[PDB]
Design a binder for this molecule. Structure first.
Ligand SMILES: *[C@@H]1O[C@H](CO)[C@@H](O[C@@H]2O[C@H](CO)[C@@H](O[C@@H]3O[C@H](CO)[C@@H](O)[C@H](O[C@H]4O[C@H](CO)[C@@H](O)[C@H](O)[C@@H]4O[C@H]4O[C@H](CO)[C@@H](O)[C@H](O)[C@@H]4O)[C@@H]3O)[C@H](O)[C@H]2NC(C)=O)[C@H](O)[C@H]1NC(C)=O
Ligand SMILES: *[C@@H]1O[C@H](CO)[C@@H](O[C@@H]2O[C@H](CO)[C@@H](O[C@@H]3O[C@H](CO)[C@@H](O)[C@H](O[C@H]4O[C@H](CO)[C@@H](O)[C@H](O)[C@@H]4O[C@H]4O[C@H](CO)[C@@H](O)[C@H](O)[C@@H]4O)[C@@H]3O)[C@H](O)[C@H]2NC(C)=O)[C@H](O)[C@H]1NC(C)=O
Ligand SMILES: *[C@@H]1O[C@H](CO)[C@@H](O[C@@H]2O[C@H](CO)[C@@H](O)[C@H](O)[C@H]2NC(C)=O)[C@H](O)[C@H]1NC(C)=O
Ligand SMILES: *[C@@H]1O[C@H](CO)[C@@H](O[C@@H]2O[C@H](CO)[C@@H](O)[C@H](O)[C@H]2NC(C)=O)[C@H](O)[C@H]1NC(C)=O
Ligand SMILES: Cc1ccc(-c2ccc(NC(=O)N3CCC4(CCO4)CC3)cc2)cc1
Ligand SMILES: Cc1ccc(-c2ccc(NC(=O)N3CCC4(CCO4)CC3)cc2)cc1
Ligand SMILES: Cc1ccc(-c2ccc(NC(=O)N3CCC4(CCO4)CC3)cc2)cc1
Ligand SMILES: *[C@@H]1O[C@H](CO)[C@@H](O)[C@H](O)[C@H]1NC(C)=O
Ligand SMILES: *[C@@H]1O[C@H](CO)[C@@H](O)[C@H](O)[C@H]1NC(C)=O
Ligand SMILES: *[C@@H]1O[C@H](CO)[C@@H](O)[C@H](O)[C@H]1NC(C)=O
Ligand SMILES: *[C@@H]1O[C@H](CO)[C@@H](O)[C@H](O)[C@H]1NC(C)=O
Ligand SMILES: *[C@@H]1O[C@H](CO)[C@@H](O)[C@H](O)[C@H]1NC(C)=O
Ligand SMILES: *[C@@H]1O[C@H](CO)[C@@H](O)[C@H](O)[C@H]1NC(C)=O
Ligand SMILES: *[C@@H]1O[C@H](CO)[C@@H](O)[C@H](O)[C@H]1NC(C)=O
Ligand SMILES: *[C@@H]1O[C@H](CO)[C@@H](O)[C@H](O)[C@H]1NC(C)=O
Ligand SMILES: *[C@@H]1O[C@H](CO)[C@@H](O)[C@H](O)[C@H]1NC(C)=O
Ligand SMILES: *[C@@H]1O[C@H](CO)[C@@H](O)[C@H](O)[C@H]1NC(C)=O
Ligand SMILES: *[C@@H]1O[C@H](CO)[C@@H](O)[C@H](O)[C@H]1NC(C)=O
Ligand SMILES: *[C@@H]1O[C@H](CO)[C@@H](O)[C@H](O)[C@H]1NC(C)=O
Ligand SMILES: *[C@@H]1O[C@H](CO)[C@@H](O)[C@H](O)[C@H]1NC(C)=O
Ligand SMILES: *[C@@H]1O[C@H](CO)[C@@H](O)[C@H](O)[C@H]1NC(C)=O
Ligand SMILES: *[C@@H]1O[C@H](CO)[C@@H](O)[C@H](O)[C@H]1NC(C)=O
Ligand SMILES: *[C@@H]1O[C@H](CO)[C@@H](O)[C@H](O)[C@H]1NC(C)=O
Ligand SMILES: *[C@@H]1O[C@H](CO)[C@@H](O)[C@H](O)[C@H]1NC(C)=O
Ligand SMILES: *[C@@H]1O[C@H](CO)[C@@H](O)[C@H](O)[C@H]1NC(C)=O
Ligand SMILES: *[C@@H]1O[C@H](CO)[C@@H](O)[C@H](O)[C@H]1NC(C)=O
Lengths: 149, 96, 353, 149, 149, 353
């Protein structure tokens, strides 16, 4: 709704779609926006107008902005926290940790076409910490090796 | 199970407890799964059984996590077992 | 092949708790309890609701394990303690007894809604049929709830929402013969409770009558049975078992007065219930007793909408009550608070370099 | 004026300058700021002060912030939408699509020194969609090739 | 306190710590946040509630947001101004300008383990402009060389 | 090895100046000068202070070279010119003389605090012992200051803060026999100044008495000496030397009236000072003279807290005064405004490619 920020809200509508579809949908909207084909509309409050009724729009005016400002800070924060895995400044970060069939013995077509993100992140939830640890280790080894040349 | 023996013609107090030390919803039932007593938050209710009358609890101890069944004017015919329904701790006691 | 890829912007939620806040159409000039409370406790209502429907999302809801319920409980218990002050209050601490001044106050519940703090949103179940738990196949996201009028009552729930299409029977376990069954009606039944200004006699000043349509009551109860029979097809609504008077009789508070009503005429035109206004009240707020000031001279009445029932069955479904948290569950059953965890991972056909 | 955000406003004053000059101007201001030679001043409203006059500054206080918050979201959005052309996270993105003399048969010195951005984006406006399509294609081919090694 | 923004405030507590410790601390918090182990709490104002008392929270509500919005703009600005040294989009940017023993004749272990950032930036303050000039020059030469292939 | 690395997010501050703003608990309905000024000049106070303690940070403060002091001076001089308007004002411009209407006004100083503009923060010295300059070993960051009640006085500073544990002797150079020594007390001493409503006689209507406890004065002065002896162990508090009457006697303004008090009974129960209310005032605002309206008929009194002294020594430390900037230094001594410069550099064991 509100409270999540534009970054999340523009992606949230894909919650009921497959993983593959979500990636394609984001690509398409970006194309239309870059080309000047479609425009993004605002959903922000108009501000009080009448002094006697102003509490109605200054309370919600401020709360709406607080939600957006915090969403920006969270977005920008994560974009740099990801430097640990070598994924800073990115939406899609491909790395060198191989996928374990023990985490999930499925093909990529099965995962991307017959599942949604809501399901995928439940099937492998108990390996999340394992994988995250490995991502950090891989980044450390890459940095080690580059600095030896 | 916990077995409590009286003098037949008197009174017995059987107890259920919770580790929360809070007043929580609870019920007491006999072996035929018929309600005897229980609460509804702060309020005490009675079960529509042979023990609908002659029975009470201690509302003041509910916030200590203590939910007793007190049967008054006790008869030998009341010497059945009883089941606690406190959280999932379905403990059993017997009245003699 | 099959390398780990990290994705940011993954539309995945997890259930979460937070210090959820209230909003209402508070006034601050009419002296009434809810509007002199809500003016410092709650913010103005949301001027721009979003209702985002999340496609084909299916979400597992559980009205009996929800947290929004506890939060509503804390605000209402604060509201009552801060307004309908008893003359004498006895809390079982030996006991601890205090007394307070008893100005009488207007008391007319207003809808209050709960709103998500920044970073959170509320998922809502939009199914016409939903039994209170398990997957809901039509989910939308909102910031604020519909609004619940905090009526505190037993046996019959007044001024709540309707099920719209069918009477819905909701229970954590419909067969355990322990939990209260919440029956949400798809139609409201009017109840007109009056204490006329001619009751000036004393031992009278505490008597009142509630008038219920026979046609409406009979149709509603027949419809309830039709659903009860689906669950229990081999059996063919009775007197309460007994207990504290707030459970045994129907009870409510209007105009600041505490009414207790005999419902055996309903569960066995113009069906009349015998009602009495009482001063010694068992608190719903916790264990203890309280004395309230004697009745107001004049004519006091309220016309309420019966929107649901609390029924129980043993090992002939009887009216039940108490446990105010359950009345709020009957309205909060469709909502949960979630947070978004945008960082996720999946195998892909790529590698670095 | 306001309503555009700091990202645009700091660039907008170059609207009357040549393309070459605009690039140099941005470079210079960045140098002075990084070095601690110059400072950026604020142009934000002071907030109400007096309760009886507060409508004047809460309406405009909120509107000024709304403009800035939306400018931030647009900036950050475009910075990732550009991932399609392989230009995410950048102000200046050099790519491998060659310039067509048919789009504009001019030298780079003529374009950068004797023209402003206002003129340049009009002379080639009817090729904008062609070029954008090619930019996407080139990025797809680069990704295809890197992942074949 | 406030007025600096979340970017600074999350780093400011390290002002009394050594340089080495500060880097490690940032790494750890990022790990805990990426893994979903810890959560960031908000410190934002609740908004007025009561109309008659609203000046108290609309003045400070707006000022708190102004501070955060400006912090975001400064953060994003610097992240691109740094393109001059070839450090755009980064927190830690390693370059090819060698360290001069004349700027400071110390080892890296002495600097990172026995000093805080408050001390380090004072000991070499009179070389700051020299170094910054060299960083720009190095970036220019790198760009020159890459574009000759 | 040892290559330059650029780091962003470096927690390093530098001292800076800015258009610092005021906040106070202003009222706008009581007609009093500070609350009809602050209502347009200052914002509501900070509802959510942070007090971030910066670890083991050591910071060099200097109360005599601070800028916050000048900023407070500009607001107070504006406050007085905009309120306590003289009937006759003479500024040495030949001279330029103007006259103004003289309504009398209530005059009761309120605490006013200074707050950092966005992009800035204030560092505060939390040491119990701090002599006004040099490294402070316990530093926290705040947006707003404690709040200074802008009492304008000489010799004795009224209604300021206390040193809590010890009397602190602060001087730019304790041995140059030129600068004023600010003595901050760790305890307040009460002074009760009254002009009773029986002084209706005229040549009287301008006489008032200030009552000081002997026990409190003697203990305080003994404690001051104990510290003075650490600095000056070979010597064992005297009459002022003379000068403008605002320096020679103690002076203050309460109720809008300007009081001048004889302090020789203090510096040589119920010690009484002889006080007079005067109409011709030498301005502290700049060089010039001003006439104020004659005394109010009725009973005027103020009870104030002595929180510090201004003493001087020549080449027996005498009361001093004037230079209002110094009274404000005694409260602003612990604060400085800084900015953060997040971009820094250091050598590391890495290279590009
Ligand atoms: C479900 O919702 C419905 C609304 O849709 C609720 O129904 C309302 O209930 C309230 C409370 O009973 C009722 O309010 C009264 O309306 C009267 C209209 O004339 C008012 O006069 C009355 O105020 C008097 O009583 C108050 C205290 O009870 C006093 O505080 C107040 O000062 C007034 O008292 C003076 O005047 C009387 C009359 O002369 C005299 O007797 C007193 O001594 C004193 O001098 C209330 O405002 C609404 O009118 C009802 N609304 C409708 C449409 O019928 C219903 O209560 C909700 N259900 C539940 C369970 O909450
Ligand atoms: C240190 O702090 C303390 C507080 O902790 C300060 O002490 C306060 O000082 C003020 C100013 O002297 C004093 O205020 C007066 O209180 C009186 C209470 O009865 C009021 O009556 C009086 O108002 C009258 O005088 C005003 C002008 O002086 C008029 O503007 C006003 O209209 C009133 O005047 C009418 O009424 C009087 C009385 O009948 C009559 O004589 C007049 O002619 C006219 O008709 C002030 O409000 C506070 O009471 C003191 N507070 C305490 C707790 O004692 C102290 O001043 C500070 N120290 C320094 C140096 O600033
Ligand atoms: C999911 O629930 C929504 C909300 O009730 C349904 O959409 C509404 O449909 C009615 C007509 O019946 C319209 O008047 C409303 O304006 C619609 N609301 C919104 C937010 O779109 C929706 O049809 C339901 N979907 C399914 C599959 O059951
Ligand atoms: C640095 O100063 C702070 C602020 O006074 C000290 O922390 C306070 O300590 C008291 C107890 O003496 C508590 O009641 C306060 O709540 C604390 N305030 C804060 C903001 O934490 C701190 O102890 C001092 N540190 C040193 C080393 O002197
Ligand atoms: C405050 C704020 C910050 C950022 C955003 C934001 C908006 C859109 C995207 N777009 C995206 O994620 N895509 C997927 C990857 C792809 C395909 C090849 O590149 C491009 C499209 C990202 C962030 C919104 C608000
Ligand atoms: C919300 C917000 C976000 C970003 C900005 C912003 C400010 C300045 C620039 N600077 C720039 O575009 N330059 C041109 C390229 C160059 C020369 C080699 O690198 C450096 C200078 C970019 C974004 C402002 C506000
Ligand atoms: C508006 C706003 C914008 C950005 C931020 C922000 C928060 C945290 C970081 N994190 C960081 O600097 N780290 C150091 C380097 C490392 C170790 C290997 O990568 C990761 C951790 C950066 C920016 C906050 C607010
Ligand atoms: C999967 O986990 C096992 C340990 O259970 C390990 O031996 C194997 O190498 C792992 N495979 C991948 C791709 O990580
Ligand atoms: C529901 O109640 C029945 C009857 O007592 C019992 O057998 C069953 O295990 C209960 N199920 C749950 C989930 O509690
Ligand atoms: C209650 O009174 C209203 C008129 O005010 C009437 O329309 C309604 O039908 C009555 N309800 C009952 C149950 O009699
Ligand atoms: C209830 O019904 C009886 C029918 O005889 C009627 O006299 C009475 O006035 C009604 N009361 C109300 C409140 O409608
Ligand atoms: C209702 O009144 C009848 C008498 O007519 C009595 O037997 C019954 O117990 C009462 N019911 C309640 C719930 O008070
Ligand atoms: C049920 O209540 C109605 C009220 O009109 C009464 O006529 C009927 O006799 C009652 N039946 C029983 C079994 O109590
Ligand atoms: C309730 O059921 C009992 C049998 O258990 C019967 O005796 C009683 O009359 C019934 N009461 C009502 C109001 O239906
Ligand atoms: C029920 O009450 C209404 C007034 O509220 C009246 O018009 C109607 O005639 C009453 N019905 C009966 C059966 O008394
Ligand atoms: C009862 O429902 C009707 C709609 O059928 C509505 O007009 C009336 O206001 C409702 N009454 C209450 C108390 O909610
Ligand atoms: C320019 O467009 C023509 C088609 O009209 C095409 O054949 C030629 O290769 C293009 N040149 C470039 C540099 O794209
Ligand atoms: C250090 O500065 C001197 C000039 O004083 C220069 O000759 C030398 O090459 C510099 N060394 C480095 C690493 O920059
Ligand atoms: C402090 O005063 C003494 C005595 O006059 C003088 O010798 C010394 O140089 C002064 N120090 C400073 C820093 O002014
Ligand atoms: C001033 O008067 C107050 C009573 O209002 C008294 O407590 C205080 O001790 C007095 N101070 C002096 C110095 O006499
Ligand atoms: C000061 O002390 C003298 C002692 O004789 C007393 O008469 C007088 O009233 C006191 N004045 C005040 C303002 O307390
Ligand atoms: C105080 O009064 C005495 C006379 O008792 C006088 O000698 C002295 O100079 C006066 N002091 C001041 C500061 O006015
Ligand atoms: C100092 O003042 C006190 C006031 O009580 C007086 O008794 C004493 O004689 C004075 N001493 C000198 C040296 O003036
Ligand atoms: C101040 O000192 C002088 C000597 O320089 C002495 O004559 C005078 O009496 C002293 N006055 C007081 C009040 O101590
Ligand atoms: C000082 O004044 C107070 C009243 O303010 C009085 O009670 C006390 O007795 C006085 N002390 C002396 C020595 O006169
Ligand atoms: C003087 O200090 C006491 C605490 O010891 C305080 O209660 C009183 O209000 C203070 N008076 C003034 C004028 O600040």
């Amino acid at each position: 709704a509100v409270g999540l920020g534009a970054f999340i809200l523009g992606f949230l509508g894909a919650a009921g779609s497959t993983m593959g579809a979500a990636s394609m949908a984001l690509t398409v909207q970006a194309r239309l926006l870059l080309s000047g084909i479609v425009q993004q509309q605002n959903n922000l409050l108009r501000a009080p107008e009448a002094q006697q009724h102003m509490l109605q729009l200054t309370v919600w005016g401020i709360k709406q902005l607080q939600a957006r400002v915090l969403a920006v800070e969270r977005y920008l924060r994560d974009q740099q926290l990801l430097g640990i895995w070598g994924c800073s400044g990115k939406i899609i970060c491909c790395t060198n940790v191989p996928w374990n069939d023990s985490w999930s013995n499925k093909t990529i077509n099965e995962i991307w076409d017959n599942m949604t993100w809501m399901q995928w992140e439940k099937e492998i939830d108990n390996y999340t910490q394992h994988i995250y640890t490995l991502l950090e280790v891989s980044q450390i080894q890459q940095e080690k090796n580059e600095q030896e040349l | 199970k916990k077995v409590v023996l009286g003098k037949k013609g008197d009174t017995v107090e059987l107890t259920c407890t919770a580790s929360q030390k809070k007043s929580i919803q609870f019920h007491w039932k006999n072996s035929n799964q018929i309600k005897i007593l229980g609460n509804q938050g702060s309020f005490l209710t009675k079960g529509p059984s042979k023990l609908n009358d002659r029975a009470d609890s201690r509302r003041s101890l509910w916030d200590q996590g203590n939910f007793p069944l007190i049967i008054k004017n006790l008869k030998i015919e009341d010497s059945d077992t009883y089941i606690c329904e406190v959280e999932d701790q379905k403990e059993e006691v017997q009245l003699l | 092949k099959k390398w780990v890829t990290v994705y940011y912007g993954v539309p995945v939620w997890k259930e979460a708790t937070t210090t959820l806040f209230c909003a209402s159409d508070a006034k601050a000039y009419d002296t009434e309890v809810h509007n002199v409370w809500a003016t410092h406790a709650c913010v103005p209502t949301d001027p721009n609701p979003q209702e985002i429907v999340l496609g084909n999302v299916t979400e597992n809801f559980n009205m009996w394990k929800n947290n929004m319920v506890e939060q509503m409980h804390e605000d209402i218990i604060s509201l009552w303690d801060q307004s309908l002050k008893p003359c004498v209050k006895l809390t079982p601490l030996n006991t601890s007894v205090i007394t307070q001044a008893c100005p009488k106050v207007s008391f007319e519940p207003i809808p209050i809604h709960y709103c998500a703090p920044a970073g959170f949103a509320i998922l809502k179940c939009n199914s016409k049929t939903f039994n209170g738990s398990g997957p809901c196949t039509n989910v939308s996201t909102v910031q604020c709830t519909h609004g619940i009028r905090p009526v505190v009552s037993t046996q019959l729930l007044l001024n709540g929402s309707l099920a719209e299409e069918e009477i819905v029977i909701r229970s954590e376990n419909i067969t355990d013969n322990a939990k209260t069954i919440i029956v949400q009606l798809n139609e409201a039944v009017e109840i007109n409770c009056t204490r006329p200004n001619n009751n000036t006699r004393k031992s009278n000043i505490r008597q009142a009558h509630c008038n219920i349509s026979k046609a409406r009551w009979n149709e509603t109860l027949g419809q309830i049975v039709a659903k009860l029979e689906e669950q229990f097809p081999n059996k063919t609504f009775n007197h309460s078992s007994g207990g504290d008077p707030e459970i045994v009789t129907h009870s409510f508070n209007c105009g600041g007065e505490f009414f207790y009503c005999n419902t055996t005429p309903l569960f066995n035109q113009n069906i009349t219930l015998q009602c009495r206004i009482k001063q010694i009240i068992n608190m719903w707020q916790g264990v203890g007793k309280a004395m309230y000031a004697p009745p107001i001279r004049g004519q006091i009445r309220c016309s309420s909408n019966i929107t649901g029932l609390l029924l129980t069955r043993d090992g002939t479904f009887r009216p039940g009550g108490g446990n105010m948290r359950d009345n709020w569950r009957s309205e909060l059953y469709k909502y949960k608070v979630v947070k978004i965890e945008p960082l996720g991972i999946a195998p892909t056909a790529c590698k670095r370099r």
